[PDB]
Write a protein that binds this ligand. Structure first.
Ligand SMILES: NC(=O)c1cn([C@@H]2O[C@H](CO)[C@@H](O)[C@H]2O)c2ncnc(N)c12
Ligand SMILES: CC1=C(/C=C/C(C)=C/C=C/C(C)=C/C=O)C(C)(C)CCC1
Lengths: 346, 324
């Protein structure tokens, strides 16, 4: 399968496609259970084009008291648009969930794409990884130039389009700093993709985003996290100890340039962590890893990877690869909740 | 006629052997046999033993996985509940009664049991219809883009209930009546005679049209569309091996699904129609137990088809069974 039937309906829409109102989008199978609510495929009434819609369920919002986090994600994504960061197309609400409808990236996400090349292929070949890394770097740089610390980044938040141009996505765990503070403290991001500074609740700058880049790249090539083996994630306290203490081992899958690059990013001393040392995001680009890359050609979209996903076959996790989270345990919405939901809606 | 008229009973066997009385006061053994009752009791026991675990699982798995509670799952929960109405209203009663060899809860009991059984079976019937509708809307895309939300789902659940009440409630206010069917140990709706004074004739026409023919058309429409859509999809995606498997698989599944609706309600419709067209054709009440057997067994096969054969549900159930 019935799950295959739901997938088949998606395929049916895609085949036709290849060849607001809140009751104005045809719903297909979910593609995951996101940060809050579900993130499902959906379709335009007026153009017949496919989009993912990250829904943040009202119930799940009340449970975590995630009202601040929602508003942040809205404002940041709404403002931030480039060629290496995804655009937001709509922000409306229903009576059950808040909706973000975001722009096409039908090539699946890098985390999926690791396994879609072949599940027994651990990550990507070196040239292919280098291309994606370069594109990710440009996205990070663009955030930093607007004075935004992301505090996160992970493979599943690096999405591929059908041409194999990648973009970073989700800016809901980010903070935009003003020009006057170059550092902030806090705990933000997904554990196991967070730098030492964040976990310890200390001041940090743009460095932490580059720590996350290191974690991402390491997983991109080797198909496992640096701080735990694949298909694992230990408790927060232990994970925190791993991030702070554990010297990451580097397989021979890597070239010398990639080994060295990974070492620089996975350094637990921010001062020695390449990324924004001497206030340069272009200092990072000088590393031998980026030998294949020319900045002008990268910016012009003239660089492509070896594996390019099909432009007629959809890619992403199905409806049985999903997660789940607490919808209300007998807890009915307060007036305050309703007022936030109204306020959120634009 | 071809039965025996009464004021609250209609034995579908003619009185001509001079032993046909009220089936609430006389033990049936002049149109049934003790062995047939043992088989009846066995069959009903089986259906309880299978039906209750199957329907319990459907509700259970949803309670322990948050994410399964979605608009499309309301109807599935409803189906499981509907089936359970048939189990505790119908099956258990019939099991008790069969061992006396007649219906021992009397005319009032007959109305009660008949109400719960009809209510159950009709919510189930219409559940299968709504489920097909939801699938048709989502997959076949018949009209331009519309969102499907929780509120709509709830309305859908309520609607099946209303249609079921529209059938189960009339015989309680004297627009038809509940009277023993089968071996006279279960009560169904009277349909074995036209009888204007009790409004049987008009009701039988209403039942046959609204509660069989209408459903039958809808079932064929929805699933016909679905197979059409999936074949088309496969044609537009012959660059994916998966889709080719899917078209064959969808055709197989659809045949199973269509057959399951047919087996359950076609016997009742068929028998009722035949008696109506050829009024004066007497047959034994054992002939009338045949539709009941098929219908009651749908409490087992409907949730097997519509729950168990979904990949997602399987995985979750396996996880739960293997200590998780
Ligand atoms: N937020 C987005 O834009 C998307 C999230 N997913 C999937 O939904 C999952 C849960 O967020 C992710 O891990 C992806 O598999 C997507 N899959 C395909 N296209 C997209 N635009 C997204
Ligand atoms: C009378 C009748 C119908 C429905 C019968 C039902 C719903 C019987 C349920 C019996 C049970 C649940 C016994 C146990 C149909 C199919 C509309 C066709 C027309 C005749």
């Amino acid at each position: 399968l019935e799950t295959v039937v739901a997938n088949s309906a998606f395929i049916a829409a895609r085949g036709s496609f290849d060849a607001m109102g809140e009751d104005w989008f045809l719903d297909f199978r979910v593609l995951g259970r996101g940060g809050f609510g579900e993130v499902f495929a959906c379709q335009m009434k007026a153009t017949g084009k496919l989009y993912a819609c990250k829904k943040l369920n009202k119930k799940r919002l009340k449970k975590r008291k995630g009202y601040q986090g929602a508003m942040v994600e809205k404002k940041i994504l709404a403002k931030v648009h480039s060629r290496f960061i995804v655009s937001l197309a709509y922000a409306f609400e229903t009576k059950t969930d808040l909706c973000l409808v975001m722009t096409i990236m039908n090539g699946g996400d890098i985390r999926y794409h690791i396994y879609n090349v072949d599940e027994d292929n651990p990550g990507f070949q070196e040239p292919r990884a280098i291309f994606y890394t370069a594109q990710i770097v440009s996205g990070l740089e663009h955030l930093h130039q607007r004075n935004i610390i992301y505090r996160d980044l992970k493979p599943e938040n690096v999405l591929l389009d059908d041409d194999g141009n990648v973009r970073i996505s989700d800016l809901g765990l980010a903070v935009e700093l003003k020009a006057g503070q170059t550092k902030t403290k806090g705990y933000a991001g997904t554990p196991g993709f967070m730098a030492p500074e964040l976990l310890l609740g200390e001041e940090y700058d743009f460095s932490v985003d580059y720590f996350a880049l290191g974690v991402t790249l390491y997983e991109m090539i080797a198909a496992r996290g640096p701080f735990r083996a694949r298909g694992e994630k230990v408790e927060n306290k232990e994970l925190k100890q791993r991030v702070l203490e554990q010297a990451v081992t580097y397989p021979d899958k890597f070239s010398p340039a990639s080994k060295d690059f990974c070492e620089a990013l996975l350094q637990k001393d921010p001062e020695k962590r390449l990324g924004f040392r001497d206030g340069s995001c272009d200092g990072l680009r000088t590393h031998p890893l980026f030998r294949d890359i020319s900045w002008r050609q990268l910016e012009a979209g003239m660089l492509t990877p070896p594996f390019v996903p099909d432009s007629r076959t959809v890619y992403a996790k199905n409806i049985q690869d999903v997660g789940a989270f607490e919808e209300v345990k007998g807890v009915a919405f307060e007036k305050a909740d309703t007022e936030f939901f109204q306020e959120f809606a634009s | 006629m071809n039965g025996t008229e009464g004021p609250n009973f209609y034995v579908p066997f003619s009185n001509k052997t001079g032993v046909v009385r009220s089936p609430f006061e006389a033990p049936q053994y002049y149109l049934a046999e003790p062995w047939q009752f043992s088989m009846l009791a066995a069959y009903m026991f089986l259906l309880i033993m299978l039906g209750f675990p199957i329907n319990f699982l459907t509700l259970y798995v949803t309670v322990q996985h948050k994410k399964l509670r979605t608009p499309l799952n309301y109807i599935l929960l409803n189906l499981a509940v509907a089936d359970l109405f048939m189990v505790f209203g119908g099956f258990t009663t019939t099991l008790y009664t069969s061992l006396h060899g007649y219906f021992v809860f009397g005319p009032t009991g007959c109305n009660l049991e008949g109400f719960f059984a009809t209510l159950g079976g009709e919510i189930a019937l219409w559940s299968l219809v709504v489920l097909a509708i939801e699938r048709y809307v989502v997959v076949c895309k018949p009209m331009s883009n519309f969102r499907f939300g929780e509120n709509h789902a709830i309305m859908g659940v309520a609607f099946t209930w209303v249609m079921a009440l529209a059938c189960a409630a009339p015989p309680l206010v004297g627009w038809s009546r509940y009277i023993p069917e089968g071996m006279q140990c279960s009560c169904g709706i009277d349909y074995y005679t036209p009888h204007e004074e009790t409004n049987n004739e008009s009701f039988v026409i209403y039942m046959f049209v609204v509660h069989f023919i209408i459903p039958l058309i809808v079932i064929f429409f929805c699933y016909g569309q679905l197979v059409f859509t999936v074949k088309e999809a496969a044609a537009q995606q012959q660059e994916s091996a998966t889709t080719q498997k899917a078209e064959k698989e969808v055709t197989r599944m659809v045949i199973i699904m269509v057959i399951a609706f047919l087996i359950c309600w076609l016997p009742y419709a068929g028998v009722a129609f035949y008696i109506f067209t050829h009024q004066g054709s007497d047959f034994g009440p054992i002939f009338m137990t045949i539709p009941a057997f098929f219908a009651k067994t749908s409490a087992v096969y409907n949730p097997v088809i519509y729950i168990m054969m979904n990949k997602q549900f399987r995985n979750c159930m396996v996880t739960t069974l293997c200590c998780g």
